[PDB]
Amino acid sequence: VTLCSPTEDDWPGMFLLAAASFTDFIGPESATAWRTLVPTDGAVVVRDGSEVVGMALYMDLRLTVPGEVVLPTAGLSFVAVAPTHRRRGLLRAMCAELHRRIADSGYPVAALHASEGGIYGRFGYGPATTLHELTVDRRFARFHADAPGGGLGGSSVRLVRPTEHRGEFEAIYERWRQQVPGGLLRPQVLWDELLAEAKAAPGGDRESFALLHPDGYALYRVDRTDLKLARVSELRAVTADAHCALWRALIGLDSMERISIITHPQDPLPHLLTDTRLARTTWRQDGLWLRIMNVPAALEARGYAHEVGEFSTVLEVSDGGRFALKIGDGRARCTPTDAAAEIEMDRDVLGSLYLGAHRASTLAAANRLRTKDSQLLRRLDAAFASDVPVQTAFEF
Amino acid sequence: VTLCSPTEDDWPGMFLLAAASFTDFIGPESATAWRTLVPTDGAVVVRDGSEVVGMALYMDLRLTVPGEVVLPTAGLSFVAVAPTHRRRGLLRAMCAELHRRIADSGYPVAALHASEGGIYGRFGYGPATTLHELTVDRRFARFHADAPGGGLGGSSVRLVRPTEHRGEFEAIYERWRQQVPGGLLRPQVLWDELLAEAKAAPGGDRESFALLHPDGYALYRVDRTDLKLARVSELRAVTADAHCALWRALIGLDSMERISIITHPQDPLPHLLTDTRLARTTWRQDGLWLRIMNVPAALEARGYAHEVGEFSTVLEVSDGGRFALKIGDGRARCTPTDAAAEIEMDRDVLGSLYLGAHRASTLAAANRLRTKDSQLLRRLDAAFASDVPVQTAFEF
Amino acid sequence: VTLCSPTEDDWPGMFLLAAASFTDFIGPESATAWRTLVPTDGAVVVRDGSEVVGMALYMDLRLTVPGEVVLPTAGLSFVAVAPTHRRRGLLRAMCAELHRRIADSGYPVAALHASEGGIYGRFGYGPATTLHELTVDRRFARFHADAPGGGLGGSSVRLVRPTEHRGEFEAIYERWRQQVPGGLLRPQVLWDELLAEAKAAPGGDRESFALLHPDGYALYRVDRTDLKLARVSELRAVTADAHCALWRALIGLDSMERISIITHPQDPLPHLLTDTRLARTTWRQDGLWLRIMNVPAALEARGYAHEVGEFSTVLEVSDGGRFALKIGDGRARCTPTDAAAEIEMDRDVLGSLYLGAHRASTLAAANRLRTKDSQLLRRLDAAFASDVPVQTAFEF
Amino acid sequence: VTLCSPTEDDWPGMFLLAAASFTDFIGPESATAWRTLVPTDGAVVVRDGSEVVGMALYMDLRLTVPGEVVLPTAGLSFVAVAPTHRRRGLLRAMCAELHRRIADSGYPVAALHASEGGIYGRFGYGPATTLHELTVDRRFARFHADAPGGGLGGSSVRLVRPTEHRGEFEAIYERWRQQVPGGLLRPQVLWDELLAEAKAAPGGDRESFALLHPDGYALYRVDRTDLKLARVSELRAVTADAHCALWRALIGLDSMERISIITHPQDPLPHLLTDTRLARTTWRQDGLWLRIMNVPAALEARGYAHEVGEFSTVLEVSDGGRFALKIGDGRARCTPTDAAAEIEMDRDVLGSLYLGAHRASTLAAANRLRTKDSQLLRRLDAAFASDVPVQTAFEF
Numbered sequence A, B, C, D: 001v002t003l004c005s006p007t008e009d010d011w012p013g014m015f016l017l018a019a020a021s022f023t024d025f026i027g028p029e030s031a032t033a034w035r036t037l038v039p040t041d042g043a044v045v046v047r048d049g050s051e052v053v054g055m056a057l058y059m060d061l062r063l064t065v066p067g068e069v070v071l072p073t074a075g076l077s078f079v080a081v082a083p084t085h086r087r088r089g090l091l092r093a094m095c096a097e098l099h100r101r102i103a104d105s106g107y108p109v110a111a112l113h114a115s116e117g118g119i120y121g122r123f124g125y126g127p128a129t130t131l132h133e134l135t136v137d138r139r140f141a142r143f144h145a146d147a148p149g150g151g152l153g154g155s156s157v158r159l160v161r162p163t164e165h166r167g168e169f170e171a172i173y174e175r176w177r178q179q180v181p182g183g184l185l186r187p188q189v190l191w192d193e194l195l196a197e198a199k200a201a202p203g204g205d206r207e208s209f210a211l212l213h214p215d216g217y218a219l220y221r222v223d224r225t226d227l228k229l230a231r232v233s234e235l236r237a238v239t240a241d242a243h244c245a246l247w248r249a250l251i252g253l254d255s256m257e258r259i260s261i262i263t264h265p266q267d268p269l270p271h272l273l274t275d276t277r278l279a280r281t282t283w284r285q286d287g288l289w290l291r292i293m294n295v296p297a298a299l300e301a302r303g304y305a306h307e308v309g310e311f312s313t314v315l316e317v318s319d320g321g322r323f324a325l326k327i328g329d330g331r332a333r334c335t336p337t338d339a340a341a342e343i344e345m346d347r348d349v350l351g352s353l354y355l356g357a358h359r360a361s362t363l364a365a366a367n368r369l370r371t372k373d374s375q376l377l378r379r380l381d382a383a384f385a386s387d388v389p390v391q392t393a394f395e396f
């Protein structure tokens, strides 16, 4: 049982492992496309000797954090241990090697999407975005008098074929991702992949359509088994007008009973309607998970809320150093110190705070971060909060 | 069709209407208990002439708002229009008369629980607390190393019969309600009612048990049809230790597969476990709705976040006046003015902001509050936020 | 945390624990009836100091084993640990004390019904009877030409009220239990309890009826929610004629679509019909679990199959001694020895073999009993098998 | 309405009938492969005159029976009567002609799989193997300390593509089928067919994977609609080590909640786990049905249990002769006699006894075999039992 970077000859074994480990497996053609995001030395495999019985890798991503700052980010993915080699320390060994390479390469953060919520905390990852499914019974849906885009004229939204307006989607998404915490750059190959999924498949998913506004788009399709359900796979809007107009069009799908979307907890949709309850929350789950690789680089790179007044504290991360943390004027300074700690937390907890999705007060109530000063808790809550609500870009 | 305060002779007709209008109807014995909370002139009825075809009333309540301030509150309830007299203006007439009496009596706010989410906005009520159902599959539940109350000794929690520890529940609840926004005083008659429901009913609900800690309690029962589901009807905890200890005991119910509770969005339970996902959000809905009766009294009575620096603005409520609003040092001053408005919103929107459950930014994104200054939005968001998370006390 | 025999004052605390631990809890009236089967010193409780946080007990039973031999048997029941005191060693301590008392009192075996199948193996109990649910769609059911009781005359079976024929049921059951491995003596109090359950309950179970034959009876009722399903709670027959006649009557319930029964794997019912498939096995589970307390007394008391020729071996029970085992003429001799073992197994495995429900070959294939001689396996299989098929009497 | 052997021109009509009669119909390409197992004169068709309105055939198979003896066996299949020609005596005529040809060709037994359980008894077929579906919730599955293949080193099992290891599967299966009662030789064309089904189908079944051990294999795939269910289509193991190791690998499929398999009643899997209940029996049904064509050849060819001592009896088969049956030293002699019968049974009953899956005692209790000597029943039970448990090879 050796651990090393795969050669070209290892990839068929890796795809075999992948097909057996991941039900949503993408097939070799698209796997080869995603592979273009894996840097040299971004992958590890474990061979039995010999066949491949373990693999893991990371992709080079760009993540937006509060203050519209974009960070290089290592996106862990394609992680798998053969069913024949469980409980043998392979995951711990693969993760440790990848984390070493990630740290040494200069990434301040790593990130992933969790197949199960209980595997990742122990490797320093905390859930940092929250996914909310809303299902709207559109038969009862009426817009509020206050809602935009219901004056007296033409509509700004068009129903179009996705593949014919790639450039407009790209441009809209690029603007979105640069101003929203959780935003990710979507490279060319992933647009290739996205638009390929837009076509109908024999005995599979149905054709996808798009609603296009100058400042937003929605991609959707009818559910394959429930023909009265439309699933919005992606809705991206830069203005409130674009967001309302797109939802006016979606609610105008008179063949459907229900419209569903995976969105975020601060989606304004429910307040667009006269009956807020019509937008039922049918599902709630963690989205992006974050491991802060370098505490001072990550804390200093992020912008903070201007409303809170300047304050200073000392933060210990359990096996990640102790720092003097000074926050004021929306910026932070984070320097080494051996002074007594005022706040302690494990490294994963810091990831959960980092994009503003969880409150320090709430984590304190679970004793996941310790302090003997509630004024400091209030200050951290306020400082780490995000003006623009945190969202989840796309799964990887 | 006349409108007036009911006499003693009207109550049987009112109970008839109630039995036909409300499936969860409580029967005459308990209705007579709840009636002790209705002040003189707190009820209206509409007679056909003659029988009672419409009714509405309010109860005298005490509501805790941020800053641990307790306000007299008119709790609307028992509202019903006969199926034979729909679409005849009865509700609008009954609500207008009750609101007049409520305003003239000196209540700064009114409140209610909504049978449907689309009836109430037009009468000035906005949803102000959010209910979250969590369902935990307790077979996989493991507590985090960091979680309190897992040292090495005895347990502080006891399993007891509710009716034998009334005084300890009362005292714990009283402490809870005074420090939590959304807290309501629970008078003696409602404790009588609560403990009566704790007994098993033939072909109805099962016996209720309690878990009692010096600083908290949980009341629960096995679901009547799903015998592997325990439903926590009420969990009230004053310290984080009490909250964790109670959940350790609940997860020790080894006969059950699932534990469910109606709680709030900031419940720390998910962070107590090693796998946060095990606490599934199975339901989400509006709780308490608020109508601000007197804007300056309500805005001045509430405490505000100290973290935000002093600022001044002008707020127009659509048919509720225009005010110079100055907020600093956690307090607000709110005085009449005819200066140009910087923020406009309908009255229900203000209720939704009032206990800190919804962000002004989010309501702005739906154009439910208008302003041309995003710095002001950030300031309102921060000022109106609640240090202690907002919760829902009990249904009325 | 002390461990001792309960006093009269402890029983209310015990019933409180029971009501919270067991959903099928029987109420204090019937609990007091079952208590008459608990000998002096047959119960233990664990107090916190003080309230009762753990309990366990055994009942004095009489179990029939192959060869129609009746053994004194300690039937463990009413075992519970408070949810507040889990993972504290209470069960292990209560079980050890009860087992000591059981052994010292002279019981050769103990027995129980398992709330969960994974708790009991480690205390020396193995599953020894198998429960099979059959559901017959009686609309298609036709009896084979060969089946008894379809000649040309009157019927021998009568439809009767259970409470009016107690004596005939008692006598039939007594004959049954003495000739069937797994049979248990049913004392007077348990007949009192059984016939009380036969009456309808408001918002509960429906009235029970009986089909009575001189050599058998069936007790049944319509399912409370599925009104096309009749549930046979108990069918006891001494002759094949009685068994067939009772099933002819059950299939004549023309209001029902389905008849279901919890029976055993060798129930001949499927072979009574022209279409064997109509008797669907809808459920399968372990019934009685056995812990052999005294290996030589238990092995010597049981009868063995005459068909296998005399043989001798050496059996080690993992922490239960090593014995020279000689079997011939349907009897066994089992004496101490230090000669090398030919067969090893844990104590629970021996319980699983003891009533003939599991084959030694099958347990060997799972390596739950070790030997390096397959001829010996064949010999054990044959010797331990039961002429009369093993059945499960009643739950306790 | 004539009955005769089909010509080449009849086969399209036969495939038309097949497509309309069998939902699981295999298509013409694979039907032509299975056709290579049909001997000359192994098929009959009924023409209306003219189109084909009835068909039936048999295939040349090799069946293993207790004592590891392999018998030529006529496997009935592809039997169908047009919906337009029901209740016209076609089946009875086709079966009688095929049975004549089968008998005259020298087959001692015929066999089939039943589309419905009530059609076949009257033509002399009795169910002779039992299929058991086990569904394991693998999230709770833990192996017993006693279970093999959990030492401290590498794994002997590999995850592989089925099509790349055909030869190893063939060799393992060949060993299996020769030592297990119910085993069938699988010719080349059926391996061609099996491996073709291993590939994914568009809007059909998913890709199949294999777990390969030197002495066993498992073939499995994720269920097409329930993506948390893995279905083991075939598991074949020659040693207990191979069987345990394969199940260790299957339970290591961490993406799945449940693993299911169609197996036999003596599968040791449940005893491999600490909680035997985790292996739920979700389905139970008859497998292979047998018609004994020649009673003395079949009874003399089979091996019998050595443990029972020599005995002699007289057996009448209802329309199949009367024989002096002498059994001793694991062999039987079966000769003609006119002496009085001690045991009578229909021919189908004998098929049900023949592979040891049903006990003579059980069939006697249903009066499906008559005798006035219970000692003889015990002797038959013991003699006809199979050392190696009876299994079902593959459907045909």
Ligand SMILES: CC(C)(COP(=O)(O)OP(=O)(O)OC[C@H]1O[C@@H](n2cnc3c(N)ncnc32)[C@H](O)[C@@H]1OP(=O)(O)O)[C@@H](O)C(=O)NCCC(=O)NCCS
Pocket (backbone or CB within 6 Å): A076, A077, A078, A079, A080, A081, A085, A086, A087, A088, A089, A090, A091, A092, A093, A112, A113, A114, A115, A116, A118, A119, A120, D254
């Ligand atoms: C990798 C895998 C299938 C199991 O791997 P493994 O080689 O058996 O794990 P290792 O022995 O290397 O060590 C993993 C540690 O986490 C624990 N662990 C691993 N998988 C687990 C699971 N599914 N549930 C709970 N705990 C788990 C182990 O107990 C071990 O810690 P411990 O020895 O201190 O108890 C499993 O963890 C899995 O489901 N995938 C993990 C996914 C992941 O981490 N990242 C990918 C998301 S893109």
Ligand SMILES: CC(C)(COP(=O)(O)OP(=O)(O)OC[C@H]1O[C@@H](n2cnc3c(N)ncnc32)[C@H](O)[C@@H]1OP(=O)(O)O)[C@@H](O)C(=O)NCCC(=O)NCCS
Pocket (backbone or CB within 6 Å): B076, B077, B078, B079, B080, B081, B085, B086, B087, B088, B089, B090, B091, B092, B093, B112, B113, B114, B115, B116, B118, B119, B120
């Ligand atoms: C009261 C009731 C059953 C219907 O009453 P009604 O006498 O028909 O209503 P009125 O004619 O007095 O006027 C009510 C106004 O709200 C609207 N409205 C009333 N009930 C409605 C409902 N269930 N859904 C949508 N709109 C409704 C009416 O259209 C009317 O406004 P409009 O005439 O401008 O359109 C109904 O509103 C109901 O479900 N209960 C209301 C509950 C409530 O408001 N408070 C109690 C919670 S404790």
Ligand SMILES: CC(C)(COP(=O)(O)OP(=O)(O)OC[C@H]1O[C@@H](n2cnc3c(N)ncnc32)[C@H](O)[C@@H]1OP(=O)(O)O)[C@@H](O)C(=O)NCCC(=O)NCCS
Pocket (backbone or CB within 6 Å): B254, C076, C077, C078, C079, C080, C081, C085, C086, C087, C088, C089, C090, C091, C092, C093, C112, C113, C114, C115, C116, C118, C119, C120
């Ligand atoms: C008794 C009870 C609720 C838990 O008791 P407890 O006091 O936490 O158990 P203890 O700490 O005394 O020790 C029990 C041992 O079995 C294990 N165990 C106990 N309950 C278990 C369960 N529900 N599942 C799996 N393992 C369990 C423990 O891990 C411990 O062994 P370990 O420390 O070596 O791992 C639980 O076992 C239960 O469900 N009832 C047991 C029923 C029984 O044994 N007999 C009654 C049938 S009538």
Ligand SMILES: CC(C)(COP(=O)(O)OP(=O)(O)OC[C@H]1O[C@@H](n2cnc3c(N)ncnc32)[C@H](O)[C@@H]1OP(=O)(O)O)[C@@H](O)C(=O)NCCC(=O)NCCS
Pocket (backbone or CB within 6 Å): D076, D077, D078, D079, D080, D081, D085, D086, D087, D088, D089, D090, D091, D092, D093, D112, D113, D114, D115, D116, D118, D119, D120
């Ligand atoms: C063949 C078929 C569809 C009906 O055939 P048919 O020509 O109507 O039957 P016949 O008239 O030739 O005679 C069949 C006898 O069995 C009975 N029978 C036939 N199909 C039956 C069914 N589905 N259910 C119950 N009884 C049936 C008939 O009543 C008749 O006996 P009877 O006249 O003494 O009552 C039907 O039996 C069927 O489902 N397939 C039979 C499958 C089979 O036997 N072997 C193939 C398994 S690979």
Ligand SMILES: Cc1ccc(C(=O)C[n+]2ccn3cccc3c2-c2ccc(F)cc2)cc1
Pocket (backbone or CB within 6 Å): A022, A024, A026, A030, A031, A032, A034, A035, A038, A077, A078, A079, A113, A395, A396
């Ligand atoms: C080399 C390579 C790298 C990644 C991939 C991908 O296909 C990643 N990817 C993308 C989008 N997705 C949506 C749902 C699931 C995914 C997967 C994925 C796959 C495996 C994981 F562990 C986590 C995520 C394929 C090949």
Ligand SMILES: Cc1ccc(C(=O)C[n+]2ccn3cccc3c2-c2ccc(F)cc2)cc1
Pocket (backbone or CB within 6 Å): B022, B024, B026, B030, B031, B032, B034, B035, B038, B077, B078, B079, B113, B395, B396
């Ligand atoms: C005079 C009088 C006043 C109120 C009542 C009550 O029973 C109020 N109450 C209390 C608790 N609840 C829980 C669920 C539903 C309730 C009801 C209730 C009843 C009617 C409503 F329109 C709204 C709420 C009964 C009588």
Ligand SMILES: Cc1ccc(C(=O)C[n+]2ccn3cccc3c2-c2ccc(F)cc2)cc1
Pocket (backbone or CB within 6 Å): C022, C024, C026, C030, C031, C032, C034, C035, C038, C077, C078, C079, C113, C395, C396
């Ligand atoms: C003192 C006393 C002793 C036993 C009991 C009984 O009621 C036992 N009993 C009987 C029949 N049953 C059918 C289903 C469940 C039962 C229970 C039972 C109760 C608890 C157990 F742990 C196991 C079984 C009640 C009181």
Ligand SMILES: Cc1ccc(C(=O)C[n+]2ccn3cccc3c2-c2ccc(F)cc2)cc1
Pocket (backbone or CB within 6 Å): D022, D024, D026, D030, D031, D032, D034, D035, D038, D077, D078, D079, D113, D395, D396
């Ligand atoms: C000439 C010819 C002979 C047989 C066949 C086959 O396809 C047999 N066969 C094989 C496997 N199977 C699994 C499920 C159902 C089957 C069928 C089958 C088909 C018809 C039956 F009456 C019984 C079985 C096809 C053509």
Ligand SMILES: [Cl-]
Pocket (backbone or CB within 6 Å): A062, A063, A064, A070, A071, A177, A178, A183, A184, A185
């Ligand atoms: Cl970005």
Ligand SMILES: [Cl-]
Pocket (backbone or CB within 6 Å): B062, B063, B064, B070, B071, B177, B178, B183, B184, B185
């Ligand atoms: Cl209050």
Ligand SMILES: [Cl-]
Pocket (backbone or CB within 6 Å): C062, C063, C064, C070, C071, C177, C178, C183, C184, C185
């Ligand atoms: Cl007995």
Ligand SMILES: [Cl-]
Pocket (backbone or CB within 6 Å): D062, D063, D064, D070, D071, D177, D178, D183, D184, D185
């Ligand atoms: Cl064979």
